[PDB]
């Protein structure tokens, strides 16, 4: 019930007590561990509200105060009366910072308390959503000096009036199945790209087309909007040694902005809550560029490098991987767009975990996600034992809207 | 109940039923996952069910389930248990059990090989000099002049827990570590404490960077005794690089035979506390972990210096760059000397085919993702993208406490 985590590189042991406040379930049992699985009423609502306000008032050191009691009373009356309730600005901000604080798959959480929260609860139309989103994009991008931000649309009501950004991130590239048999662009977006097209978009059918936003307000049929091109900061990818790298014609965008997730605060569900920070280099250079089912460029890069691709044991794949990742980091830095390498990010996270243990009694972490997808054991997180559990406020997965939507 | 795992690279979905046969626990609950935690005297009472379950599984695998022979065997084990309180395995059940422990070892990537295992039965062994002799034969058979063969040597089972056989070494072959007076370590930091025990027991330490440790062997609960493995039996590979001629001048070498000797084999409720086993190396074990962990030989700096990488900002990825070259070197050196080794691409690919085969024929393959994914280049290996289910089947290999912590010294 009081749990230890050991760092096997440093022998440092931390005691976790925060897990006892755990609410949601993991997917695991005593008979089976599902640690590597990607996706493992009035009555219900009041406990959730109470649990949240209790932690809020504790955080501002007013636990058991008249204002604590009165707010519980007030929210309680409101749920009874309206079957839902509204968060104060202060609670919304707290809730959102803590959803990030609790994100067990996020290595960058040392930043959790510096989050700019844009309250878009007064939004009513997809055009409004579009405007909020363009402002988020421009604020967060900040001409390359990126600032963490979230934009929070109105909460779910009877679930027939859901706000949703159909896009998986605010900024992503289109994917096109070809008569050729191959895929042009990003293969992960082939389906959403068709949805756009079938909804009206005229695709330029190139390798790196920024997708349009498909925005759904108030349970309505979603609508299309192009993000002003001038707001979408992109980086051409070059290598500081290989002159030929530029000729591959690779670019990526500066702003990683997950937009398909659900923010749960005090039992309330915010189904449109796009958020952004800044990239860790591996996300682009290892995953986006090298996954076989993504841009899958390893083979082309290896050839340009003239490596021995005869035998897997020459480690040509591994050699090409390093160079691609040097090139990503170098290009972002050269253009002064915020980026972090996996060494510095993981080092930060270890420090953040120390802080959270010391200050909060723990830090839920998902080792499978936290360890970078290259050079695992030469980053300190590899050697760090982690306990994974689910705390609220949280970011949660939700089904893609096109399987739900009734048109 | 059916459980599905999906591969996110291929969309291949597999269905696991084998997890239903699992009884032992994971460390996880519905409220906490302990999947990254390294480590999360038996009555007749508990022994017969364990025996029965094992023999049911044995008799099924030989298509003799419910046969007269199956039944006579259950009766014979049962009478042996509550009469002598324990029981002896037939040679065939011992072989079957040691293979299955391997088959079931969820942190093992090399398990496509599980049915090709040479089982050496050392249960007639009685003394530490006897153990030394068995261990030498294992080393020599397994080494096979570089053409490595998987083997396990199985010493007598636990009885009262006061007469345990134990190999005090953590692997049969490993290099000494020496903590220096200035605080630096010579040799391998992982083996400092053990190297200190050896010295205390009377080993004369060469005190270099790669001194093969002596075997410290406990027979029948007796104080352990030292022995030197004949040097001619210890195959070693000097590490050089195909293109960097200064690489040899780092003075690096490693041994060819990875032979875990501190684990406990459980078969049918019986506990075999000395059961050293060996296969062959995946290159990353040496080139990533043994050479480049900060707590081990820690050669990244000296290698990157020689390569003259930009070392002032980690975002040059100088570490990653040196890491690849070192791993190239390890594989190149083993191949050149004709000593068996597998690269992490080849091994993870084979594992994936192993795993799908196991899902089809067996109903599952328990696998620990944290351990299966290699410690470099994780996501360009197919395992990274493979969902896995981790659960515990018997027969199995288990951890046990280091014997210097529990041993009652005779003097
Ligand atoms: C400040 C810079 C940040 C860094 C360097 C960072 C780092 C990361 C990385 C590397 C991932 C894994 C991405 C993947 O494999 O797809 C991740 C996941 C995540 N981060 Fe962050 N993060 C940052 C900011 C944020 C912000 C601002 C939030 C929310 C306010 C957040 C919430 C999350 C969540 C919820 C996930 C899991 C998403 C999923 O399951 O796909 N992070 N973080
Ligand atoms: C034939 C070639 C083999 C290969 C390439 C191989 C590969 C590996 C690797 C790379 C590890 C992880 C080692 C570490 O991080 O310390 C491992 C773990 C393991 N393998 Fe194998 N293996 C092989 C044979 C065997 C054999 C013969 C057995 C026993 C009969 C075995 C049982 C295990 C066990 C129990 C572990 C977990 C070790 C631990 O928890 O410390 N493997 N395997
Ligand atoms: C099957 C496995 O859970 C899946 O590949 C995970 C592994 N670790 C990951 N880690 C991160 N950060 N992001 C991912 O998408 C994944 N994919
Ligand atoms: C804390 C963490 O569980 C620990 O570092 C594990 C990670 N994965 C591993 N994987 C393998 N094969 N071997 C190991 O020693 C480890 N160490
Ligand atoms: N830095 C972050 C968090 O905000 N990334 C979130 C997901 C982005 C994805 N990993 C990608 O490579 O596009
Ligand atoms: N290939 C195997 C199993 O036979 N490895 C066992 C552990 C070897 C350890 N990783 C080492 O580097 O010494
Ligand atoms: Zn688990």
Is A377 within 8 Å of B331 when comparing Cβ atoms? no
CA distance A308 to B31: 48
Name the 3-class secondary structure at B400. Answer: coil
Contact A152, A119 (CB under 8 A): yes
**Minimum-distance CB partner of A8 among B38, B314, B377:** B38
- In this structure, the strands spanning A13-16 and A262-265 are unpaired
Contact B204, B309 (CB under 8 A): no
Distance (Å) of CA B234 to CA A144, A247, B119, B242: 58, 51, 20, 25
Residue positions counted in chain B: 411
Residues of A with a catalytic annotation lie at: 106, 109, 278, 283
Adjacent-strand bridge partners of A234: A253
Name the 3-class secondary structure at B386. Answer: strand
| Beta carbons within 10 angstroms of residue A70's beta carbon | 10
Phi and psi at residue A225, to the nearest 5°: -150, 135
Breaks (C-N over 2.5 A) in chain A follow: 40
Query: A151 CB contacts (<8 Å, ≥6 apart)?
Result: A118, A120, A132, A133, A135, A136, A273, A274, A275
Name the 3-class secondary structure at B6. Answer: strand
Cα-to-centroid distance, B370 and ligand 4 (Å): 6
CATH architecture of B236-258+281-346: Alpha-Beta Complex (3.90)
- In this structure, the strands spanning A149-152 and A116-119 are parallel
Chain B residue with the nearest C-alpha to that of A378: B293
Three state DSSP letters for B271-307? EECCCCEECCEEHHHHHHHHHHCCCCCCCHHHHHHHC
DSSP string, B133-155: HHHHHHHHHHHGGGS---EEEEP
CA distance A121 to B134: 75
Specify the CATH number of the domain B16-123+150-160+264-278+348-372. 3.90.340.10
Ligand 4, CB cutoff 6 Å, lining residues: A 8, 382-385; B 36, 38, 370-371
Cα-to-centroid distance, B389 and ligand 7 (Å): 9
- Residue A404 token pair: 């739900």
Burial (CB < 10 A; 0-12, 13-18, 19+), residue B124, is: exposed
CB of B279 closer than 6 A to ligand 2? yes
Is A375 within 8 Å of B335 when comparing Cβ atoms? no
Resolution, Å (one decimal): 1.8
Is A35 within 8 Å of B30 when comparing Cβ atoms? no
- For the question of residue B111 being annotated catalytic, the response is yes
CATH superfamily of domain region B124-149+164-235+399-403: Nitric Oxide Synthase;Heme Domain;Chain A domain 2 (3.90.440.10)
Three state DSSP letters for B19-71? HHHCCCCCCCCCCCECCCCCCCCCCHHHHHHHHHHHHHHHHHHCCCCCCHHHH
CA distance B274 to B153: 8
CATH architecture of A234-256+279-344: Alpha-Beta Complex (3.90)
Atom number of ligand 6 nearest to Cα B110: 1
Adjacent-strand bridge partners of B151: B118, B278
HSE of B269, CA atoms in CB hemisphere, 13 A: 22
CB of A370 closer than 6 A to ligand 1? no
Strands, sheet with A268-270, edge to edge from the N-terminal-most edge strand = A268-270, A262-265, A394-396
Query: A147 CB contacts (<8 Å, ≥6 apart)?
Result: A116, A139, A140
| Beta carbons within 10 angstroms of residue A219's beta carbon | 16
- Candidates B302, B296, B294, B295; CA nearest to B326 is B302
C-alpha dihedral over B387, B390, B393, B397, to 10 degrees?
110
- Candidates A186, A141, A321, A68; CA nearest to B324 is A321
Q: Which residue has tokens 């030292």?
A: B226
- The number of the ligand nearest the C-alpha atom of B33 reads 7
CB of A108 closer than 6 A to ligand 1? yes
The annotation places the binding site of A at 36, 106, 169, 278-279, 283, 368-369, 382, 397
Distance (Å) of CA B251 to CA B243, B288, B292: 17, 17, 15
CA distance A127 to chain B (A): 35
Please give the distance of CA B65 from its chain centroid, rounded to a whole number. 32
- For the question of residue B280 being annotated catalytic, the response is yes
- For the question of residue B275 being annotated catalytic, the response is no
Selected catalytic residue, list B111, B158, B166, B240 = B111
Name the 3-class secondary structure at B217. Answer: strand
CATH 1.10.10.10 fits A122-147+162-233+397-401, yes or no: no
Cα diameter, chain A: 74
Sign of CA dihedral A355, A356, A361, A365: negative
CA distance A3 to B27: 11
> Helix H segments across B337-376?
344-362, 369-372
Contact A19, B32 (CB under 8 A): yes
Atom number of ligand 2 nearest to Cα B98: 30
Q: Give the H/E segment covering residue B89.
A: none
Contact A281, A339 (CB under 8 A): yes
Q: Which of B375, B378, B381 to mutate to test the pocket of ligand 4 (most atoms within 8 A of CB)?
A: B375
CB of A258 closer than 6 A to ligand 5? yes
Q: What angle do CA A55, A105, A111 make, to 5 degrees?
A: 65
Q: Could you give the angle at which helices B44-61 and B91-103 cross, rounded to 10 degrees? A: 90
Is A33 within 8 Å of B30 when comparing Cβ atoms? no
Among B380, B391, B392, B394, the residue to mutate for chain A (most A Cβ within 10 A): B380
CA distance A337 to A278: 9
Distance (Å) of CA A289 to CA A62, A294, A315: 49, 6, 18
CA distance B218 to B131: 8
Distance (Å) of CA B316 to CA A281, A324, A344, B311, B312: 11, 12, 12, 7, 8
C-alpha dihedral over B368, B374, B379, B384, to 10 degrees?
-20
- Residue A236 token pair: 């051409």
Contact B97, B55 (CB under 8 A): no
Contact A223, A126 (CB under 8 A): yes
Sign of CA dihedral B75, B78, B79, B84: positive
**Minimum-distance CB partner of A317 among B38, B368, B377:** B377
- Indicate which technique resolved this structure: X-ray
CA distance B21 to B23: 7
CA distance B170 to B177: 13
User: Is B285 annotated to bind ligand?
Assistant: yes
Is A319 within 8 Å of B324 when comparing Cβ atoms? yes
Query: A310 CB contacts (<8 Å, ≥6 apart)?
Result: none
Sign of CA dihedral B225, B230, B233, B239: positive
Name the 3-class secondary structure at B219. Answer: coil
Query: B376 CB contacts (<8 Å, ≥6 apart)?
Result: A318, A374, A375, A376, A377, A378, B284, B288, B323, B324, B327, B344
Query: B73 CB contacts (<8 Å, ≥6 apart)?
Result: B55, B59
Three state DSSP letters for chain A? CCEEEEECCCCCEEEECHHHHCCCCCCCCCCCECCCCCCCCHHHHHHHHHHHHHHHHHHCCCCCCHHHHHHHHHHHHHHHHHCCCCCCHHHHHHHHHHHHHCCCCCCCHHHCCCCEEEECCCCCCHHHHHHHHHHHHHHHHHHHCCCCEEEECCCCCCCCCCCEECCCECCCECEEECCCCCEEECHHHHHHHHHHHHHCCCCCCCCCCECCEEEECCCCCCEEECCCHHHCCEEECCCCCCHHHHHHCCEEECCCEECCCEEEECCEEECCCCEECCCEHHHHHHHHHHCCCCCCCHHHHHHHCCCCCCCHHHCHHHHHHHHHHHHHHHHHHHCCCCCECHHHHHHHHHHHHHHHHHHHCCCCCCHHHHCCCCCHHHCHHHHECCCECCCCCEEECCCCHHHHCCC
Nearest-CA residue for atom 8 of ligand 4: B371
Contact A8, B38 (CB under 8 A): yes
Chain A residue with the nearest C-alpha to that of B27: A30
Name the 3-class secondary structure at B226. Answer: strand
- Residue B228 token pair: 């030197």
CA distance A400 to A167: 9
Nearest-CA residue for atom 11 of ligand 4: B371
CA distance A225 to A219: 17
CA distance A346 to A343: 6
Is B33 within 8 Å of A38 when comparing Cβ atoms? no
Contact B232, B212 (CB under 8 A): no
Contact B101, B395 (CB under 8 A): yes
Is B389 within 8 Å of A32 when comparing Cβ atoms? yes
Chain A residue with the nearest C-alpha to that of B241: A314
Cα-to-centroid distance, B94 and ligand 6 (Å): 23
Is A30 within 8 Å of B29 when comparing Cβ atoms? yes
CA distance B108 to B373: 10
Cα diameter, chain B: 74
Cα-to-centroid distance, B328 and ligand 6 (Å): 18
CA distance A239 to A225: 34
CATH class of the structural domain A16-121+148-158+262-276+346-370: alpha beta
Domain ranges of chain A: 16-121+148-158+262-276+346-370, 122-147+162-233+397-401, 234-256+279-344
CB of B370 closer than 6 A to ligand 3? no
Cα-to-centroid distance, A53 and ligand 2 (Å): 50
CA distance A136 to A143: 13
CB of B287 closer than 6 A to ligand 6? no
Residue positions counted in chain A: 407
Q: Give the H/E segment covering residue B83.
A: helix B68-84
CA distance B4 to A5: 30
Adjacent-strand bridge partners of A179: none
Adjacent-strand bridge partners of B150: none
Among A22, A27, A32, the residue to mutate for chain B (most B Cβ within 10 A): A32
Adjacent-strand bridge partners of B212: B175
- Kindly calculate the radius of gyration of chain A based on its CA atoms and give it in whole angstroms: 23
The annotation places the binding site of A for L-arginine at 169, 278-279, 283
- Residue A178 token pair: 């070809």
User: Is B398 annotated to bind ligand?
Assistant: no
CA distance B18 to A406: 40
- Residue B323 token pair: 């890491």
């Amino acid at each position: 019930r009081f749990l230890k985590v050991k760092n096997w590189e440093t022998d440092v042991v931390l005691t976790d007590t925060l897990h006892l406040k755990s609410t949601l379930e993991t997917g695991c049992t005593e008979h089976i561990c599902m640690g590597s699985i990607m996706l493992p009423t009035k009555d219900q609502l009041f406990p959730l509200a109470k649990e949240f306000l209790d932690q809020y008032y504790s955080s501002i050191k007013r636990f058991g105060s008249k204002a604590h009691m009165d707010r519980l009373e007030e929210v309680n009356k409101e749920i009874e009366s309206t079957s839902t309730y509204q968060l104060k600005d202060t609670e919304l901000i707290y809730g959102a910072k803590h959803a990030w604080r609790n994100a067990s798959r996020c290595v960058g959480r040392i930043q959790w308390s510096k989050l700019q929260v844009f309250d878009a609860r007064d939004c009513t139309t997809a055009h409004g959503m579009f405007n909020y989103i363009c402002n988020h994009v421009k604020y967060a991008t900040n001409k390359g000096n990126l600032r963490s931000a979230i934009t929070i649309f109105p909460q779910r009501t009877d679930g027939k009036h859901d706000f949703r950004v159909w896009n998986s991130q605010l900024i992503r590239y289109a994917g096109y199945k070809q008569p050729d048999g191959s895929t042009l662009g990003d293969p992960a977006n082939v389906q959403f790209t068709e949805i756009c097209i079938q909804q009206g978009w005229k695709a330029p059918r190139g390798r790196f087309d920024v997708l349009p936003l498909l925005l759904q307000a108030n349970g309505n049929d979603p609508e299309l909007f192009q993000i002003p091109p001038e707001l979408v900061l992109e980086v051409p990818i070059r290598h500081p040694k290989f002159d030929w790298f530029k000729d591959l014609g690779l670019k990526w965008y500066g702003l990683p902005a997950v937009s398909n997730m659900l923010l749960e605060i005090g039992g309330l569900e915010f189904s449109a809550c796009p958020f952004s920070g800044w990239y860790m280099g591996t996300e682009i250079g290892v995953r986006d560029y090298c996954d076989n089912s993504r841009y899958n460029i390893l083979e082309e890069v290896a050839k340009k490098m003239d490596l021995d691709m005869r035998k897997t044991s020459s480690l040509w794949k591994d050699q090409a991987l390093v160079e691609i990742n040097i090139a990503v980091l170098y290009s972002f830095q050269s253009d002064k767009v915020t980026i972090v390498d996996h060494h510095s990010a993981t080092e930060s996270f270890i420090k953040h975990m120390e802080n959270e243990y010391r200050c909060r009694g723990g830090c839920p972490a998902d080792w499978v996600w936290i360890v970078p997808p290259m050079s695992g054991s030469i980053t300190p997180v590899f050697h760090q034992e982690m306990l994974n559990y689910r705390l609220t406020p949280s970011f949660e997965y939700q089904p893609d809207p096109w399987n739900t939507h009734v048109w």
